[PDB]
Scaffold this active site. Structure first.
Site, short mmCIF file in Angstrom:
data_model
loop_
_atom_site.label_atom_id
_atom_site.label_comp_id
_atom_site.label_asym_id
_atom_site.label_seq_id
_atom_site.Cartn_x
_atom_site.Cartn_y
_atom_site.Cartn_z
N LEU A 18 32.69 22.77 21.64
CA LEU A 18 34.10 22.39 21.87
C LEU A 18 35.07 23.57 22.01
O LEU A 18 36.12 23.44 22.66
CB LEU A 18 34.59 21.46 20.76
CG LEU A 18 33.95 20.07 20.62
CD1 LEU A 18 34.31 19.44 19.28
CD2 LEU A 18 34.41 19.16 21.76
N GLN A 20 35.61 28.23 21.30
CA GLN A 20 35.05 29.54 20.98
C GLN A 20 36.19 30.44 20.49
O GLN A 20 37.29 30.39 21.04
CB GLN A 20 34.34 30.11 22.21
CG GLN A 20 33.81 31.53 22.08
CD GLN A 20 32.90 31.74 20.88
OE1 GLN A 20 32.19 30.83 20.47
NE2 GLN A 20 32.92 32.95 20.33
N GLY A 21 35.94 31.23 19.45
CA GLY A 21 36.95 32.16 18.96
C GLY A 21 36.58 33.23 17.95
O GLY A 21 35.41 33.49 17.66
N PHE A 23 37.29 32.90 14.92
CA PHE A 23 37.35 32.07 13.70
C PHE A 23 36.05 31.37 13.27
O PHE A 23 35.83 31.13 12.09
CB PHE A 23 38.45 31.01 13.86
CG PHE A 23 38.25 30.09 15.05
CD1 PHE A 23 37.38 29.00 15.00
CD2 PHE A 23 38.95 30.31 16.23
CE1 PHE A 23 37.18 28.18 16.10
CE2 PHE A 23 38.78 29.49 17.33
CZ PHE A 23 37.89 28.42 17.27
N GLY A 24 35.19 31.04 14.24
CA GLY A 24 34.02 30.15 14.02
C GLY A 24 33.64 29.44 15.31
O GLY A 24 33.94 29.94 16.40
N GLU A 25 33.01 28.26 15.22
CA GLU A 25 32.79 27.45 16.44
C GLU A 25 33.13 25.94 16.29
O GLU A 25 32.51 25.26 15.46
CB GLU A 25 31.36 27.66 16.96
CG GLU A 25 31.06 29.02 17.62
CD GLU A 25 30.14 28.91 18.85
OE1 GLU A 25 30.52 28.21 19.81
OE2 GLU A 25 29.04 29.52 18.88
N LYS A 40 32.74 22.24 12.57
CA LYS A 40 33.14 23.63 12.68
C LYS A 40 32.26 24.50 11.83
O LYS A 40 32.00 24.20 10.65
CB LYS A 40 34.57 23.85 12.25
CG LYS A 40 35.14 25.20 12.70
CD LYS A 40 36.07 25.89 11.71
CE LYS A 40 36.45 27.24 12.26
NZ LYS A 40 37.05 28.18 11.27
N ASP A 131 51.88 26.06 9.04
CA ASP A 131 51.82 25.76 10.44
C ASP A 131 51.72 24.23 10.78
O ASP A 131 50.76 23.50 10.43
CB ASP A 131 50.62 26.46 10.94
CG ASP A 131 50.74 26.83 12.38
OD1 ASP A 131 51.64 26.28 13.11
OD2 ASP A 131 49.83 27.62 12.71
C1 LIG Z 1 38.24 23.25 17.22
C2 LIG Z 1 38.31 21.65 17.09
C3 LIG Z 1 38.29 20.90 15.93
C4 LIG Z 1 38.42 21.41 14.54
C5 LIG Z 1 37.43 21.16 13.60
C6 LIG Z 1 37.52 21.67 12.32
C7 LIG Z 1 38.61 22.45 11.96
O1 LIG Z 1 38.54 22.95 10.65
C8 LIG Z 1 39.66 23.11 9.84
C9 LIG Z 1 39.48 23.96 8.76
C10 LIG Z 1 40.51 24.12 7.84
C11 LIG Z 1 41.69 23.44 8.00
C12 LIG Z 1 41.85 22.57 9.06
C13 LIG Z 1 40.85 22.42 10.00
C14 LIG Z 1 39.61 22.71 12.88
C15 LIG Z 1 39.52 22.18 14.16
C16 LIG Z 1 38.23 19.52 16.33
C17 LIG Z 1 37.95 18.25 15.73
N1 LIG Z 1 37.90 18.06 14.40
N2 LIG Z 1 37.74 17.18 16.51
C18 LIG Z 1 37.82 17.34 17.84
N3 LIG Z 1 38.10 18.45 18.54
C19 LIG Z 1 38.29 19.52 17.74
N4 LIG Z 1 38.56 20.81 18.17
C20 LIG Z 1 39.32 21.21 19.38
C21 LIG Z 1 39.45 20.18 20.50
O2 LIG Z 1 38.15 19.65 20.83
C22 LIG Z 1 38.24 18.48 21.64
C23 LIG Z 1 39.67 23.85 17.18
C24 LIG Z 1 39.77 24.77 16.04
N5 LIG Z 1 39.87 25.46 15.13
C25 LIG Z 1 40.02 24.52 18.51
O3 LIG Z 1 39.17 25.12 19.17
N6 LIG Z 1 41.28 24.33 18.94
C26 LIG Z 1 42.14 25.41 19.42
C27 LIG Z 1 41.55 26.02 20.69
C28 LIG Z 1 42.34 26.44 18.32
#
Ligand SMILES: *[C@H](c1c(-c2ccc(Oc3ccccc3)cc2)c2c(N)ncnc2n1CCOC)[C@@H](C#N)C(=O)NC(C)C
Length: 261
Positions: A18, A20-21, A23-25, A40, A131
């Site tokens: 989904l 890349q960064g 931060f993790g995946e 993630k 944020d």
């Molecule tokens: C990636 C992403 C997530 C997602 C999953 C878990 C977290 O973890 C977290 C840790 C601590 C506090 C809050 C959150 C963050 C984000 C996600 C989910 N859950 N479901 C669907 N799509 C998701 N994406 C992005 C969109 O995918 C369709 C994101 C992150 N980090 C990300 O890549 N988004 C931006 C580009 C930063």
């Protein structure tokens, strides 16, 4: 021992990449082979479990229907953390999306009500976000928003919190108030024409975003009181959860639909 949140590694299946960064995946995936799940990953040469699993506790403590449910965790490195897969992704992209085109004001405020929701629950459990923005707010089937990233974006940040670090939940309202322009102008940068220094210089010197084209002056009032100087005479997220949720009965029963909103 270990906590209940824990599970085995063979049941998990990662099936779509989904993001890349640095931060993790971000991955989609399957837990137990028949349950859709969002995953993630974190690295074991750019972080440590304790250092980033402090964000996990705060997640594991909080459990509400408009904050992204942290279903489960894998503690021993590598550290997969697991979550309800919100399908339609981030809200910023859903609004600059194809959809965001036809999206009208009844759904722009209802989602915004759904988030006023989530930010009330945090507010009652006495946490701050730091944020809050459209770029963070998740979304799923039938427009189901949630907020996330719990535990630089100076365009969404209250002056007290840009300059001093008075990050108090009357910073997260200001943001919400900025969030409120995004929905109502489709992910178009908060503070058009303007850049991070010009912002402050002006913000302070009085300036606040004018009502969007075609947007009711009541919501601008809700906006302009999320942006009041003295933090603590901003409205609460419960006051806001209510004002938005009953908006069209109690506030604007005068709106027929328009050219964008
Ligand atoms: C990636 C992403 C997530 C997602 C999953 C878990 C977290 O973890 C977290 C840790 C601590 C506090 C809050 C959150 C963050 C984000 C996600 C989910 N859950 N479901 C669907 N799509 C998701 N994406 C992005 C969109 O995918 C369709 C994101 C992150 N980090 C990300 O890549 N988004 C931006 C580009 C930063």
């Amino acid at each position: 021992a270990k906590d209940a949140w824990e599970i085995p590694r063979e049941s998990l299946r990662l099936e779509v990449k989904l993001g890349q960064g640095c931060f993790g995946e971000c991955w989609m995936g399957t837990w137990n082979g028949t349950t859709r799940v969002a995953i993630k990953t974190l690295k074991p040469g750019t972080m440590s479990p304790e250092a980033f699993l402090q964000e996990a506790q705060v997640m594991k403590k909080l459990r509400h229907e408009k904050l992204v449910q942290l279903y489960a965790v894998v503690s021993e490195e590598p550290i997969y953390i697991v979550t309800e897969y919100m399908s339609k992704g981030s809200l910023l992209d859903f609004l600059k999306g194809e959809m965001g085109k036809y999206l009208r004001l009844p759904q722009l405020v209802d989602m915004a009500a759904q988030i006023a929701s989530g930010m009330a629950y945090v507010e009652r459990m006495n946490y701050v976000h730091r944020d809050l923005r459209a770029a963070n707010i998740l979304v799923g089937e039938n427009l189901v928003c949630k907020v996330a990233d719990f535990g630089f974006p100076i365009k969404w940040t209250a002056p007290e919190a840009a300059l001093y670090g008075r990050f108090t939940i009357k910073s997260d309202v200001w943001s919400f108030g900025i969030l409120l322009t995004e929905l109502t102008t489709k992910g178009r940068v908060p503070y058009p024409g303007m850049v991070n220094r010009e912002v402050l210089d002006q913000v302070e010197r009085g300036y606040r975003m004018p009502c969007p084209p075609e947007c009711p002056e009541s919501l601008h009032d809700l906006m302009c009181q999320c942006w009041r100087k003295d933090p603590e005479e901003r409205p609460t997220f419960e006051y806001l959860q209510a004002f938005l949720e009953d908006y069209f009965t109690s506030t604007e029963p005068q709106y027929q639909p328009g050219e964008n909103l």
